[PDB]
Structure 1
């Protein structure tokens, strides 16, 4: 056969995915055995096989990864790898909600004496 197309792999579930994953390894192992002592057009298949397995692996992982992200939402604590990663320094600034709080005396003055919109004639 040939390379497995990435288009159909998305509309599956884990059971066929693992069967396809399991079978693909089998031919790759055996087909390699032919490589010793004989060179032919079958060598091209070796590259195609390896590359196909990669696609199926990412699909299984991506499908699994999305599922538990939904599960851990609406929760206070979640795993370290699913938390957003920006920057060590960027994760420790004060939040905008707290970096914008003010005191009552400061608020009292600004409610009654804010900046105005004036103009001066010449």
Structure 2
């Protein structure tokens, strides 16, 4: 409820909220198999709240780990692209040429000209 408030709460408070909503979804599943008419719609509301809390906890964990690792990065934290994009040469490697080619660009580059 109110993910903005969830982002304020600390990790101990967030896991305490997670425990409460799990106990409360269980009490509803007991109600669902016995009898009720308006406790059934609480299932959707509370199941989504459990997802909401776990999303916030997870997003905080990854942001913390991304800060703590900015040497080698863990495999799940690495930039995920297509497999072919990851195998590409860097711009430094793509733009590297040897001396005999760097000289000709220094001495004889293409000029800007016009015909009268």
- Mapping of 1:1-122 within 5 angstroms? 4-73=1-70, 75=71, 77-121=72-116
- Where does structure 1 lack aligned partners over 5 or more consecutive residues? none
User: Would you say how many aligned residue pairs link Structure 1 and Structure 2?
Assistant: 116
- TM-score using structure 2 length: 0.92
Q: Secondary structure at the match of 2:83?
A: coil
Q: TM-score, normalised by structure 1?
A: 0.88
Q: Secondary structure at the match of 1:9?
A: helix
- RMSD between superposed Cα atoms in Å: 1.2
CA distance in 2, matches of 1:83, 1:108: 39
Q: Which structure shows the bigger proportion of residues in helix conformation?
A: 2
Provide structure 2 residue ranges, at least 5 long, that are not aligned to the other structure: none
